Amino acid sequence: FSAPAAYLTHQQKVLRLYKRALRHLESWCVHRDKYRYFACLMRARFDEHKNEKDMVKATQLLRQAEEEFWYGQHPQPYIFPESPGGTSYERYECYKVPEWCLDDWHPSEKAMYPDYFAKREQWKRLRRESWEREVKQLQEETPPGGPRTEALPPARKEGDLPPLWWHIVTRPRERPM
Amino acid sequence: KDMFPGPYPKTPEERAAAAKKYNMRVEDYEPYPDDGMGYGDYPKLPDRSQQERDPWYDWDHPDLRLNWGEPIHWDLDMYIRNRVDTSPTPV
Amino acid sequence: KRLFIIKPSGFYDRRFLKLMRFYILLTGIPVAIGITLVNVFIGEAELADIPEGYVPEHWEYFKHPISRWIARTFY
Amino acid sequence: NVLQIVRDHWVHILVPVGFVFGCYLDRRSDEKLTAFRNKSLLFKRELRPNEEVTWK
Amino acid sequence: MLKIIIPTTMLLPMTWMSKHNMIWINATVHSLLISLISLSLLNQLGENSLNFSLTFFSDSLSAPLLVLTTWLLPLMLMASQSHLSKETTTRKKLYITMLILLQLFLIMTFTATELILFYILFEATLVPTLIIITRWGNQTERLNAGLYFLFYTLAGSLPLLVALVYIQNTTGSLNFLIIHYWSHPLSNSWSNIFMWLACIMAFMVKMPLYGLHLWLPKAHVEAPIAGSMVLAAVLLKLGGYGMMRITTILNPLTNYMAYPFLMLSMWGMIMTSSICLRQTDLKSLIAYSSVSHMALVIVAIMIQTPWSFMGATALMIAHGLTSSMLFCLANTNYERVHSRTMILARGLQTLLPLMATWWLMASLTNLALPPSINLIGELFIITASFSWSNITIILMGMNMMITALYSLYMLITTQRGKYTHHINNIKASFTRENALMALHILPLLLLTLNPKMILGPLY
Amino acid sequence: SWDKDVYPEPPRRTPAPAPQTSLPNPVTYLTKIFDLLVDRPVTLAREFIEQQHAKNRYYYYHREFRRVPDITECEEKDILCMFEAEMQWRRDYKVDQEIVNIIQERLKACQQREGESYRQNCAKELEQFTQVSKAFQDRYSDLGAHYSARKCLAKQKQRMLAERKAAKE
Amino acid sequence: MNPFASLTLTTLIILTIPIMMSNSNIYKTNLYPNYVKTTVSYAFTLSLVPLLMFMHTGQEMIISNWHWMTLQTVELSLSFKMDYFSVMFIPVALFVTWSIMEFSMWYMHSDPFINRFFKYLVLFLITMMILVTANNLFQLFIGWEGVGIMSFLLIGWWHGRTDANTAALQAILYNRIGDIGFVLSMAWFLTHSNAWDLQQIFMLNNECPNMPLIGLLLAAAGKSAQFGLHPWLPSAMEGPTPVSALLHSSTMVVAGVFLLIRFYPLMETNKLVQTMTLCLGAITTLFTALCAITQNDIKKIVAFSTSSQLGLMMVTIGINQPHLAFLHICMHAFFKAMLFMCSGSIIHSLNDEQDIRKMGGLYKAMPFTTTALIIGSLALTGMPYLTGFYSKDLIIEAVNMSYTNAWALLMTLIATSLTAAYSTRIIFFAFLGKPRFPPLVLINENNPLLINSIKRLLIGSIFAGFIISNNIPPMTVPNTTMPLYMKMTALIVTIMGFMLALELNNTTYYLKFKYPSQTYKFSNMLGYYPSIMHRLPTYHNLSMSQKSASSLLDLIWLETILPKTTSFIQMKMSIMVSNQKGLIKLYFLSFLITIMISMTLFN
Amino acid sequence: IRLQEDPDPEDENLYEKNPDSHGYDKDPIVDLWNMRVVFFFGFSIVLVLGSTFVAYLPDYRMQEWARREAERLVKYREANGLPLMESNCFDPNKIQLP
Amino acid sequence: PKYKPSRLATLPATLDPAEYDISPETRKAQAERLAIRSRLKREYLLQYNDPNRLGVIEDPALIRWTYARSANIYPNFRPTPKTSLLGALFGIGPLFFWYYVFKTDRDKKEKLIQEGKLDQTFNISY
C-alpha cells in the first residue's frame, strides 16, 4: 500500500464517493450498455458542481450526495474476488509461510535446495550490513518529536538500502502454492 | 509497573498520566464510568468491530486489523472479525 | 518457472511419525502374527460338561487360549 | 568393562527388585488371611487326593 | 497391591542415586514399567472387589484411576524435562521425587480400605502439589494460587475429618466393606444434615463446584505443566472417588440435600463454559472447561443412579486424559512464545502442522465427538439426568453447545488465521512433545474400543 | 449351535423361483460368481483351520455355584453370611439382566423378520418382553446406585405390606 | 441372502481402505486422489449387487456384527440396518461422490493438500455411510456428529480466510442446536423403551409421544437447514466448490430428512409432528427460494435452491409420504450436484468469478456445461420425464390431494414458481446475454475429468428417475383420479415462474435505472435474518459471559463473599490481638478483669 | 535496585547444537537413548502389549457365565411353564412380614 | 429516508457529520493522532526489521489489556448498590429459578408415581 494521511481533502472525499457511486451503479446495471449510459449521467451530476467554489456549499452538497448514496446503496454490491469481502479474499493466506522458517530446516532439507539457500545467505548478509545505516538514516531524517507521518524516506546515498526494507522486499508471494 | 492499568482517574493530572500510559491523546482518553464494576482507568474505546476498520490500511496484525502499541478495546475478543460485528448496514 | 516454496521444516514431524510407526510395529507385528497363529492352530475350547469327580482349574473355565494363559499365569 | 557398566547402571535393578519383593509381601498377607480355606458356603469342597490346601 | 506400591517407592532411591545424565531416562523407564504392572488390576471381578489385604483393595472404580495415575507419571516427567533443564541436579531430583511421592500417595488413596486412611492420604496429596506449584511456578501469582488451593482444600477437609471420626465412634468401623454391608439410613435431623454436609463439602471442593471453584483457575494457570497435569487429571477425580465412596452412608438424606448442589452444578456448567467463551488466557480456558466437565460428574454423583455412576467414571477418565493433553499443548505453545495470551500466537497450523493435528483431536475429544469415551460418559449422565427430570435436557444440551463452541474457538484462535509476524522463535516441534501428545491421545481412542473397563463397578 | 428354544426362529419359507421373462436374472449369475470366487476359497480356509483345531481339541467348562442362604435367612450383623448372600444376590441380578437381554433379542429379531407384518406377528414377543420388564422393574428399580440385597428385601417387604393393605380393602 | 450381507458390509469396509493407506507412501505420492476415486468407483460397483438382489426379491437384513458393550439390560452392538433406504442410497451417494471426486481432481489440481482434500472427502463419505447404515441411535449419532465435524473441517479448508473459519463455526453451531434435539430423542427412547435399536424402539412405541419426535424434528432441521437454522447452509459456500457440491448439496444436507424418514413408522403415529414438519418445510421453501431470487453469487443461488428442495422434502414428510421424500432425496442428489459442478466449472474458467453480474455470454463459450446446466435446471423445475418429474411432480400432486394446512400448500406452490425463477436467473444472467467477464479470455472446459464427471451426472439426471421409479416396489397408493388443473398445476406454476422471471430479465435490459424496493432489500438481505439474528444474540451472550459471569460473579462477588471477607476479618482480628502496646499496666488490668469474670461466671 | 544477572536469553533451541535433537536433554547420545526409551517402552510395550493384555484379559466379570446361566434358566422356565422372571427377589416364605 | 444508527449498526463515516468538520482544532487533533500512530508504528517497525532480534516483540497494550481484564477487576471493584443488586440477581436468581422449576417437576412426577398414574411400562433403565 501507501503511507496514510492525517485527513482527506474535500476533493479527495468527492473522488472516493465518485468511485463508490459508479461501482454501485455498475452493480445495479448488470448489462454493460445500461451502466455506460447511466455512468455519464452520474458523471454529469458531478460535473454540474465541479465549478462549485463555496466550501460550505460544496460540503453541504457532499453530505447530500453521501445520504443519496446510502439510500441508493446496492445491498449486495460486486466486490472483486481477491478484494476484502470477496469470495477469494485471504484464500491463499494459509499457504503464505514466513521466510524465517527456512532457517529452521534440517540440513538434509537445506541440501535439497543448495543453490537457493546459498543465495538466501547473501540476502541475509545484505540486511545486516545495511541495517545500521538504516536506523542512523532514520534518526537523521526524523523530526524532533519523532515521526508525525508513517511515510519512510528512501535511500539518500548510494550503497544504502531504504530503511526498514527486509519485510517488504522478502514478503510472501501472492500465490505460494 | 507504572505501565499497568490503575484505578479510576480522579484528578485531571491522573487522567493525563493514564492517557500517556495508554498512548492516547489526553482529549481522546475516556475512562469507563466509575460504577464500581472494576473497569478502572482503562480507556473506553469506541464500540466498533475490527471488521469496520479500514481493510486497506496496513495493520501490524492484519487478521486482527490492529497496530502494535495501539490501545486495545476492552471487549476486543467479542469484537474480533470472527465474532459480533457492529458494521453499518444498508437498511 | 520452478519457484522455491517456503515451507515449515517437515523432517522432524515425518521423523516422529516414522519412529512411532516403527516402535508400534516392532511388537505389534510379532503380536499380530502370534495371535493369528494361535487362533488358527491352537484354536478355542469346547463347552464340555464337567466330568464326574473332577475339579476344573480356574484357567479351565475360559475359552480363548490367550485368555486362559493370562488367567493361569498372571492371576 | 562390565564392572564400569554395573558401576553406573546399578540403580536399574531397584524397582524390579521392588516388584519381586512386593509380590512376596502380597503373598505373605494372603497367607495370613487363610482363615476360610474351604469354609465358604459356596466353594466348600473336599481336597483332591494329594492336595495340601486349595490356596484360597 | 504392594506389587505396585513397592516399585513406586523404589523409584525414589533410584532417582536420588541416578547419574545426572540418566535421571529422566531411568525415571521414565521404570514409571512405564510400573504402569504396565498396574494394568493387571483392570481384571476386576464381576461382583466382589479385589480385596488384596486388610488395608488395600480395588474395584472397577479404583482400578482405572490407579492405571491413570501410574500412566500419568511418565508423561509428567517427559513434559517437565523441557523447562527443568537448566535446574541444578539436586533440584531436578527433588522435582522428580515430588512427582513420585504424589503418585504413591494417590495409589494409596485409591486403594485404601479404611476411610480415615483415605482421608489422611488424600489430604497428604496437598503437600507435594503445594510444593510443586509454589516452588517451580513461573509467575508471581504462584504463592497466592498455592495459598488458595491449600486453604480451600483444608477448609473442606477438616469438617470431613471430624465427621469421619464421629462415624468411627458411632458405627465402629470406617472400612468401606463394613460401612457398605452395615449401612443404616440417615434421618432428616439437623445433626444428620450437618454430617452429610461435612461428608460432601470436602469432595465438592476437591472437584471444582461453582462457587467453590475459584482456586482452580489460579492453581492451573500458575502451576508448572506437570503440576497442572496432575491437578486436572487425578487430583480433581479424588473428589469424585471420595464422594462416590462416601455416598454409601449418606442416604436417603442425599435425596433432600442434593437439590442445592445439583442446581449449583447444573447452572455452573453453563456459566463456566460461557466464561471459557470469553477468556484471554489459554490455561484459564482449559481450567474453566475442566470446571464444567467436573460439574457434570458432580451432578451424576448426586443423582445416584447406576447409569449416572457409570457415566461419571467414564467421564472422569476421559477428562483426565483430555485436560492433561490440552495443558501439554498449551505448555508447548507457551514455551515457544513465553506468553499465555491466547490472541498472541495465531496461525500456528501453518508453522506446526502435526501439533495442529494434535490440537484438533484434543479439541474433538473435549467437545465429546462420538464415539469417544468423553461422549459415552456425557451421554450416560445426560440420560440419567433426563430420568431424574426431563427439564435437565435444556441445560445439558446448551452446555454441549457451549463446549463445542469454545473448543473450536480455541482451535481457530490458536491453530488458524494469519500467522503472527514478529514471533520468529517458533521452532519445529520436538519429538518429545509429539510423543507426549501421542501418549495422551492413543490410549483414549483405544479405550473407546473396550469402554467396559472404564465404565465403573456398576457396569 | 445355540438353543433354538431360547432363540426361537420360525421355519424359513422361501418361495420357489418361477421366472416369467426370457431375460436372464443378473442376480443368479452374480451369486454364482460370488460363490465360486469367494465362498469356495473361504470355505477351504475354514476347513484347514477346522482341521488344525480338531488336532488341538481341548475343552473349557462352565463354573456352577451352589445355592447360598439368602439375606432373609441371615443374622443382623453376620457379615460372613451377609457377604455370601449379597454375592448370591448380585449373581442372580446379573442372570436376570441377561434374561431380559435374551427376550429383547427375541423382540428385535421378530421386528425385523416379520417386516411390515411386525405389529401383528410379534404379539407373543411383545407380551413376553412386557412380562419380563414388569417383573425386573418390580424386583430391581429405584434401589439406587448403591444397590444391595438388603435393599431388594426392603422393597419386597414394602410391596408385600402394600399388597396386604390392598387385600384387606 | 449370504452375498447380500457380504457385499453390503464389503462396500463400507472397502471405503475405509484409503484412510488406512493414508499412512503409506501412496498418500505422499500423487496417485492418492486417483486411488481414492478408483476405490469409490469399485465400491459403487459392489453396491450395485445388493441393489440388484433387493430389486429382484426385496431382501432386507440387519447385521449386528460386533457387540460394543452391554449396559445392564441395554446391549449396544454395531448393527448395519440394510433396508430399502440404505441399500438404494448407498449406490446413489457413491456414484455422486465418484463424479464429485473426478471434478475435485480437476478443480483442486493446484491445491497443495489435494491428497488431504481427497482423504477428507472419503472420511465424510464414511461418516455418511455410517449414518445411513445405522440400526442403533448411537451409531446414527456417530454418523451425525462425524458428518458435522468433517463439514467443519472442509468448510474451513482455507484457514487463512477468516470468513471460512466463521462459516465453519456457524455450521457447527446450528448443527449442535439440532444435536440437542437428537440427544433428547436418544435419552427419551432409552428411558421409555429401554432400547437404542430401531427394532425395539419401533415395536414398543405405537403412540410415540410428542417429545422424542419433536427432538428428532429439531435435529433434522439442524442438519437439513430448515427455517430458524437455515443460514448455515448458504454460509457453507465459503468452502471449496467440490465440498459444497458433495456434502452441502447431496449427502450432508439430506441427513435430517433421512433421520425423519427412518422414523416414519413412529412419525405416522403422531399427528402434531406431521403438521409441524409440514409448516416448517413450507416456511423454508418460501423463504429460501425468495432469497435465492435476488442472490448475485451463483453458489449462493444453488445453495438456497438446495435448502428449498430440503424444505419440499420436509413438506412431503408432512403429507405422511416418506418414500416419496426419499425418492426426491435421490433425484436431488443426482441433479443438484451436477448444477454445483457446472457452477464450479464456470468459476474455474472465469478465474474465481462467483458473481453472476460479471458472468455473461457463456451459452456458446462453454457448450457442454451449458447443456448440463440446462438439463439440470429443467429437472430441478420438474421437467416432465426427468428425475425431477418422477419425484417433485408426485410430491406436489400428493400435497394438493391431501388433508393439508392450506397455507402450507399455498407456500409450496408459490415456492415452485420461485424455483423456475432462480433457475431463469442462473441461466439468463450467466449463460445467456453478452459477455461481462474481464478480458483475457481463458475459458476452457476441454478437460477429460470434468467432462466425464458431468457426463455421468447428466446420464443420471436424464434416465435415473425413470429407472429407479420403475424398479422400486410400489409403496405409496397413487391419487389416480384428480382434477385436471390440479394434475397440471406443477407444470402450470413452473411455466408461470419461467415466463415472469424471463420478463423481468428482459426488462433488466431496458435502460431504466430504478432505486431498490423495500421488498428487494428484504429478499437480498436474506430477510435480514443473518444480520439481526447473528449480531444481537452473539453480542448479548458474549457481553453477559464477560461481565456478569466472568467479572461480576467470579472475579468480584464470589471472591468477596468467601475468601476476601474471611481474610479481611482475620487481618482485623490480628491487628486487634497484636495491639503492640506492651504495657504491664494494661494487660495486668485485663488479668484482674479476667479473674473477676471467671469467679462470677464459673462460680 | 539490585545487582542481578540480566534475564537469560530465549531458551537455546536444542536444534542449534545438534540438528537431530528429539528434544529431551542436550547430549545427542542421551537424547537418542531417551527417545528410544520413551518410544520403545511407551509405544511398543504398554500401548501395544498391555492393550493386548487387557484385550484378552480373562472374563472375571462373569458376562459369558451370566449369559449361559440365563439360557439354562430360560430353557427350564419355558419347559415347566414357570414365568421367565418372578415378582420377588426373595422367597416370601422366609419373610416374616410384620 | 435516512439511516438510524444502532449499537450493533453504527453510523458510517460518510453519513457521520463529524467527518465533514474542517475546523483547525479538529485538523490539529487528527495530526496529533497520526503522530502518536506514527511513533508507535516506527518503534514496532524498528524492532520488527532488526536482524539481530530473535523473539516476540512485547506489546505493552496487550499486557495492559490482559491485566485489566483479569488482574485489575477486583482492586477497582466497589460494593455499589448497582453492583450488589446485579450480582445478587444474576448469582442466586437463576439458581433459585432453576431450583423452583426442577423441584416442581420432581414433585409432580413423584405424585404421579404415588398414585400410579405415571407410565413406566418399559422404564427399567434409570
Subunits with 3+ Cβ pairs within 8 Å of C are A, E, F, H
Burial of G591 (0-12, 13-18, 19+ CB in 10 A): exposed
B35 contacts in I (CB within 8 Å)? 80, 82-83
Which chain C residue has its CA at the smallest distance from F63's CA? Answer: C61
Q: Which of E407, E406, E286, E279 is nearest to E343 (CA)?
A: E279
Tally the C-alpha atoms within 13 A of residue A40's C-alpha that lie toward its C-beta: 5
Q: Which of C13, C27, C61, C74 to mutate to test the interface with H (most CBs of H within 10 A)?
A: C27
State how far the Cα of G165 lies from the Cα of G391, in Å rounded to an integer.
36
Experimentally, how was this structure solved? cryo-EM
DSSP, collapsed to helix, strand or coil, labels residue F96 as helix
Residues of B in contact with A84 (CB under 8 A): 55-56
Residue I46 has its nearest CB partner, among A7, A67, A135, at A135
Residue G80, C-beta contacts closer than 8 angstroms, at least 6 positions apart = G8, G9, G12, G62, G63, G65, G86, G133, G134, G135
Q: Is the dihedral of CA G25, G28, G31, G33 positive or negative?
A: positive
Residue of G158, G162, G428 to mutate when probing chain A, most A C-beta within 10 A: G158
Which residues 87-126 in chain I show a CB within 8 A of chain B? none
Interface present between H and F (3 or more CB pairs within 8 Å): yes
Residues of F in contact with H66 (CB under 8 A): 91, 94-95, 97-98
For chain D, what is the largest distance between any 2 Cα atoms, rounded to a whole number of angstroms? 62
CA nearest to H30, candidates C11, E26, C14: E26
Q: Do chains D and I touch (3 or more CB pairs under 8 A)?
A: no
Q: Which of F158, F55, E406 is nearest to C43 (CA)?
A: F55
Residues of F in contact with C60 (CB under 8 A): 60-61
Distance CA E100, CA G151 (A): 44
Residue C22 near residue H44, CB atoms below 8 Å:
no
**CA distance linking residue E272 with residue F139, whole number of Å:** 41
Give the E:F interface size as CB pairs under 8 Å.
38
The residue type at E129: T
- How many Å apart are CA G301 and CA E231, to the nearest integer? 52
Greatest alpha-carbon pair distance for chain A in Å reads: 71
**Nearest CB to G551 within list I73, I122, I125:** I73
Chains that touch F (3 or more CB pairs under 8 A): C, D, E, G, H, I
Residues of E within 8 A of H10 (CB-CB) are 338, 425
Pairwise CA distance, residues G432 & D1, whole Å: 90
**F59 beta partners:** C46
Interatomic CA distance for residues G330 and H58, integer angstroms = 48
Q: What is the Cα–Cα distance from G17 to F165, expressed in whole angstroms?
A: 67
Contacts of I119 in chain E (CB under 8 A): none
Closest by Cα among E49, E61, E64 to E177 = E49
- Please indicate if any CB of chain I lies within 8 Å of the CB of F137: yes
Cis upstream peptide for A147 (omega within 30°): no
Q: Do I and A count as touching (3 or more CB pairs closer than 8 A)?
A: yes
Residues of E with Cβ-Cβ distance to D17 under 8 angstroms = 10
Q: Chain E: give the shortest CA distance to residue B47, in Å.
A: 17
Q: What type of residue is G310?
A: L
Region for residue G440 given its phi and psi (left: phi exceeds 0; alpha: psi -120 to 50; beta: otherwise): left
* Inter-residue long-range contacts of I20-29, CB under 8 Å, 24+ positions, other chains counted: I20/A59, I20/A62, I20/A63, I22/A10, I22/A55, I22/A59, I27/A6, I27/A7, I29/B25, I29/B27, I29/B28
* Per-position DSSP letters for G423-441, written without gaps between them: HHHHHHTTTSSS--S-SS-
F103 close to F7: Cβ distance less than 8 angstroms: no
Give the distance from CA G596 to its chain's centroid: 86
I96 interfacial to chain G (CB closer than 8 Å): no
Helix (H), strand (E) at residue G520: helix G518-524
Q: Residue G82: enclosing H or E segment and its boundaries? A: strand G74-82
| DSSP one-letter code for D11 | G
C5-39: string of b/e by CB count within 10 Å (b at 16+)?
ebbbbebbbebbeebbeebbebbbeebeeeeeebb
- Closest Cα to residue E68, out of E132, E114, E4? E4
Residues of B with CB under 8 A from a CB of E: 60-64, 68, 76-78, 82
With CA atoms as reference, report the closest residue to B64 among E304, G340, G373, G162: G162
CB pairs under 8 A between C and E: 31
Chains A and F touch (3+ CB pairs under 8 A): no
Please report, to the nearest 10 degrees, the dihedral formed by the alpha carbons of residues G479, G485, G489, G493 taken in order: 180
Distance CA G420, CA G501 (A): 8
Question: Helix or strand or coil: residue H83?
Answer: coil
Report the residue numbers after which chain C has a gap, meaning the C atom sits over 2.5 angstroms from the next written residue's N, or none. none
Query: Residues in chain H whose beta carbon is closer than 8 A to a beta carbon of chain F?
Result: 62, 65-71, 73-75, 78-79, 83-92, 94-95, 97-98
CB contact under 8 A, I122 and G194: yes
Beta bridge partners of G78: G66
Of the candidates E205, E408, E374, E202, the residue with the CA atom closest to the CA atom of residue E293: E374
The phi and psi torsions of E50 (rounded to 5 degrees) equal: -75, 85
Whether residues C35 and H52 touch (CB distance < 8 A) is answered with yes
Paired residues of G75 in beta bridges: G70
CB G478 within 8 Å of CB G321 = no
B53 CB burial (10 A radius; 0-12, 13-18, 19+): middle
Among G191, G533, G539, G542, the residue to mutate for chain I (most I Cβ within 10 A) = G191
DSSP string of G17-76, one letter each residue = HHHHHTTSHHHHSTTHHHHHHHHHHHHHHHHHHHHHHHHHH---EEEEEEEEEEETTEEE
Number of neighbouring beta carbons within 10 Å of residue F39: 15
DSSP string across C3-42: --------HHHHHHHHHHHHHHHHHHHHHHHHHHHIIIII
* Cβ contact G188:G215 at 8 Å: yes
- Number of C-beta neighbours around residue G473 at 10 A: 9
Q: Do chains C and B touch (3 or more CB pairs under 8 A)?
A: no
Query: Parallel, antiparallel, or unpaired: how do β-strands C46-47 and F59-60 relate?
Result: parallel
CA distance G291 to G520: 9
Q: Does A72 touch chain G (CB under 8 A)?
A: yes
Backbone angles phi, psi at G350, to 5 degrees: -90, 15
Q: What resolution, expressed in A, was reported for this entry?
A: 3.2
The dihedral through the CA atoms of G23, G27, G33, G39 has a sign that is negative
Q: Which of G68, H56, E307 is nearest to C75 (CA)?
A: H56
Which among E198, E105, E199, E213 is positioned nearest to E152, based on CA atoms? E213
Per the CB < 8 Å rule, is F119 touching G206? yes
User: Cell for E219?
Assistant: 492453581
Cβ contacts (< 8 Å) between G190 and chain I: which residues?
Answer: 125
Chains E & I: contacts with CB separation below 8 Å: 62
G74-82 vs G61-71, strand pairing mode: antiparallel
Rounded to 10°, the helix G298-318/G210-224 angle is 160
Instruction: Please provide the size of chain H in residues.
Output: 98
Residue F148 vs residues E182, F75, F82, F154: alpha-carbon distances, Å: 11, 16, 10, 10
Give the number of other Cβ atoms within 10 Å of residue G599's Cβ: 9
CB contact under 8 A, I103 and E259: yes
- Which chain I residues touch A141 with a CB distance below 8 Å? none
Q: What letters, b where the CB count within 10 A reaches 16 and e where it falls short, cover G514-548?
A: eebeeeebbbbbbbeebbeebbeebbebbebbbbb
Residues of chain E found within 8 Å of residue F151, distances taken between Cβ atoms: none
Distance (Å, whole) CA H63 – CA F95: 9
CA atoms within 13 A on the CB side of A18: 15
